[PDB]
Amino acid sequence: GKCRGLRTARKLRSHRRDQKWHDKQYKKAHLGTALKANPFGGASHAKGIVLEKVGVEAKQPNSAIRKCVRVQLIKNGKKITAFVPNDGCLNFIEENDEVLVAGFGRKGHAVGDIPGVRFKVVKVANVSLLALYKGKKERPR
Amino acid sequence: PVARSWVCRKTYVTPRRPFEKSRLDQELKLIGEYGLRNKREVWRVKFTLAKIRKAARELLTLDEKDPRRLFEGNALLRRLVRIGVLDEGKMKLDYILGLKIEDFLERRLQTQVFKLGLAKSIHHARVLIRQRHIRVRKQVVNIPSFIVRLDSQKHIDFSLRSPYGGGRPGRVKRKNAKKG
């Protein structure tokens, strides 16, 4: 059982401090290795240069090809794989152009049937993918 | 350093559950009866009532003969009576918690214009207020969410410059009559 004495504040506080390190979220947030391993460096978004276009096959139950891009970030020179969301949006991305990529929505975890992909392309060549998809804007000529 | 002030307060709260049928039905019913623009007006009045209720609960947790309880409760009760939300005789802190958002939505300038025979419908009342046809006592009031006080109820005229009260024909009437 837990100690409940009027002079046990030190024991309770120290035990809580020690036992918080056994929490996955707390340890990831405070021990400071996830941030150093994070290619974004804690940023919400990042900018990179599209190195090549790849097709990642879906998982076991789903059969499809996800058109992703190998992107080399400018801030730290790390190579990541970023998902180009909609259909025919890979036709807007070319070789060697700037691309703004965000997370995939699970704080660094793979999303859906795409294996090992945690980033999605948000903007290409300073014009958003949504604008190109809906025709609101066109890629610079 | 600047002489400017930054104290700014959000007047509403969004509900915890976005899509629940009961809450959506009640909010749309309130909008329908009182002719409100959107859901944020309902949320604003609900926030006002919630703050009032929180104050009432705080005061009710104190002793009956507590100077802070007495002073703050008398102030709150007088304020709620002055805007006509509370009855003149229901001047206890327990009757605060028994109030509803209806008691506050009934005191808007839209509702009072519609219920004083000044407008055909509540949406007509809002259109009248937003177009400077309505005045209170002497000031031309233009904001439909104006919560009229109890002594301000008896003076809601039809302005002195509006076509309905001031007699100067409006743009449409003038243009139509000038070609006839």
Binding site: - | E20, R53, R57, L60, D94, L97, G98, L99, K100
Partner: protein, 218 residues
Amino acid sequence: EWMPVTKLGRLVKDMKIKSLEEIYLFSLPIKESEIIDFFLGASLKDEVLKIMPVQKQTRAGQRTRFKAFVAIGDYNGHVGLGVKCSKEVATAIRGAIILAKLSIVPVRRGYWGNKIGKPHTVPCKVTGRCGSVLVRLIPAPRGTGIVSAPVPKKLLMMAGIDDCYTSARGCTATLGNFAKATFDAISKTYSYLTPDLWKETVFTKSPYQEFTDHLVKT
């Protein structure tokens, strides 16, 4: 038409029982839903809390029956909960409504603070348990509504409660256990001894004893 098969039902159809609380007073079992129809049928409302398919593995395949959780009650302090498993949804819901009728219990209502007006909240903190589901009901100030999950909110609203604080612990995802724990917490409202109930019991004649002479000749 309704022909009672039990002594209590015959007494009820004989207009010899003045109220359902008189039947509750002696804790007599109710086995004819027609009694509840007789006493509160004009005010009872039922609500299908859930339909769930339950499968039994067999040689040929999976035999699927349907379990209906139905909460009934009038919004004046009587509520019941009934669960019925049957081959088809319609008869499962019918049986669940009947069972909810048979399980209707009185609900005691109280005051959080001052006792002005009519009772609005639970008389005291009560708690129901059902297979790891813990449901605590706490008196709440007048006009605060029911602060609860949708399922206990339905059960509490149907019981005549309009101000209540709630706490739930365990696998509340399982709607059946959540509903049963809420029903148990509601049912415990009249089983909690309170200083105003310290007055000595003044016993009254049982429905059967008072009206035995009625069927002594019959």
